[PDB]
Every structure is written in C-alpha cells, then in structure tokens.
Amino acid sequence: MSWRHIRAEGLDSSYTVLFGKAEADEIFQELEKEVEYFTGALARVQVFGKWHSVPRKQATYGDAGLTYTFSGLTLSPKPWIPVLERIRDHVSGVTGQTFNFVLINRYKDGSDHICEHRDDERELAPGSPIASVSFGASRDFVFRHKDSRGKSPSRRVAVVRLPLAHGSLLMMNHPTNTHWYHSLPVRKKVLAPRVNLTFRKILL
DNA sequence: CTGTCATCACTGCG
DNA sequence: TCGCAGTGATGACA
Numbered sequence: 675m676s677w678r679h680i681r682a683e684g685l686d687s688s689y690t691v692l693f694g695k696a697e698a699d700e701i702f703q704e705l706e707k708e709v710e711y712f713t714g715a716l717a718r719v720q721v722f723g724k725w726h727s728v729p730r731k732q733a734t735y736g737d738a739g740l741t742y743t744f745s746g747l748t749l750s751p752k753p754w755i756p757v758l759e760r761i762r763d764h765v766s767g768v769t770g771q772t773f774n775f776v777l778i779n780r781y782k783d784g785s786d787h788i789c790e791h792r793d794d795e796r797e798l799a800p801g802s803p804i805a806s807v808s809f810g811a812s813r814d815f816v817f818r819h820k821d822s823r824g825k826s827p828s829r830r831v832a833v834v835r836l837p838l839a840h841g842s843l844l845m846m847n848h849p850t851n852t853h854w855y856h857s858l859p860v861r862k863k864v865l866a867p868r869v870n871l872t873f874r875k876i877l878l
Numbered sequence: 879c880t881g882t883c884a885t886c887a888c889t890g891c892g
Numbered sequence: 893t894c895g896c897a898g899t900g901a902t903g904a905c906a
C-alpha cells in the first residue's frame with residue numbers, strides 16, 4: 675500500500691487506495707442497499723434567504739450516546755451497521771486513528787456536489803484528523819487556500835486538485851482545515867453515483 | 879441582549 | 893461544460 679503526501683502551504687493530507695476493487699465493489703453494493711438517508715427538513719437548506727434541497731443525500735452514524743449539532747439543533751446519529759463498522763475498522767487498523775462518527779454524502783451523479791467549505795471543528799476533538807473514504811464514481815476534489823478565494827484574493831496560492839477514486843482514503847490533517855477550503859465541484863460528464871464517508875472524532 | 883463573524887447553494891451570466 | 897460574481901438569515905461567540 676502506497677501513500678501520496680499532499681503538501682502545500684498549511685496543507686497536509688495523505689491519500690491512498692485503501693480498498694482493492696473487489697472489496698470496494700462489495701462495500702459499495704452494501705452501502706447502496708443499507709444506508710438510510712435524510713428526508714424532510716434535514717434535506718433542505720436556506721441560503722441567502724432562499725430554500726433549496728441539499729445537493730446530495732446525507733446520513734450520520736456513530737457510537738451510542740453521541741449527539742451532534744446540525745444548525746443549532748441537537749441530533750443523534752444512527753447506530754452503526756456492519757458495513758460501516760467494517761470500513762471504520764479497516765481505517766483504524768491501518769492508520770491507528772479512531773473515529774466515533776461518520777457523515778455520509780451520496781452524490782447521485784456529477785450534478786450533486788458540495789461547495790467550498792471548511793469542516794466545523796467546534797465539536798471535534800482538538801487536533802483530530804478527518805478520514806474521507808470514497809466508493810463508486812471517481813470525483814474531482816479541490817483544495818483552495820483561504821486567502822486565495824473570491825474576486826480579489828490577497829494571495830495567489832495555487833489550487834490543489836485530485837480525483838478521489840473508488841476505495842480511496844484521504845486523511846485530512848491539521849492545519850489543512852484551518853487554512854484551506856475543500857469542495858467536490860459539479861462534473862456533468864459523471865453519470866454514476868458516489869458515496870463518501872467522512873469519519874470524525876466528536877467530543878464525548 | 880448586542881454586535882461581529884462565518885456561512886450555505888442557487889441564478890444569471892460569459 | 894465550467895466556473896465566476898453576486899445574492900442574507902442564522903447561529904456561534906464574547
């Protein structure tokens with residue numbers, strides 16, 4: 675197993691293909707059968723005073739007794755199911771990092787996406803990495819430095835682009851999430867679904 | 879309670 | 893097809 679070190683100013687991440695094709699295919703099939711995604715209010719978001727559907731399906735799973743916040747609201751993730759525990763255990767066995775929570779984002783095709791953002795670290799264990807595991811269609815992932823955004827950025831730090839492949843793990847390490855925003859842009863030629871699992875270590 | 883700060887994804891272009 | 897510029901109500905925080 676080979677790791678690519680992704681390095682830039684205030685960016686430290688590591689990328690590998692963690693699951694081979696056969697295993698990744700099995701896992702994808704099981705995620706597609708079993709994951710229960712949000713419906714109703716949790717699948718809506720208000721942006722500049724207009725209501726939209728979240729442009730991807732989402733779900734959370736995690737340890738018993740954990741709660742988290744979604745926009746001021748206190749929520750409980752769903753209990754682990756075996757396929758998710760299988761993924762988590764492989765990530766932990768390889769990296770030595772442990773997680774108690776996962777956010778699942780399912781992009782039905784290239785029109786589902788997520789805009790430039792930094793992960794909310796407020797309820798995360800201090801200094802903890804985030805482990806991003808991907809199954810299904812490859813999708814382009816983009817890191818952009820915080821001071822290189824918008825119309826007249828103060829700095830011209832180069833963007834960092836990579837595809838996240840089927841069965842891959844991207845470890846995003848501190849201080850990546852302080853200095854960089856990441857996104858999964860629209861890619862209209864991608865017709866197939868992708869399921870991404872972002873494992874986190876939440877306080878408690 | 880107040881006031882600052884960061885934030886989410888769309889439309890309408892080019 | 894890609895992606896820029898412009899669009900604010902809301903919650904975190906001190």
Ligand SMILES: O=C(O)CCC(=O)C(=O)O
Binds near residue numbers: 779793806838856
């Ligand atoms: O789908 C992805 O790889 C990114 C998801 C992500 O960054 C997030 O939900 O915080």
Ligand SMILES: [Mn+2]
Binds near residue numbers: 791792793856
């Ligand atoms: Mn993220």
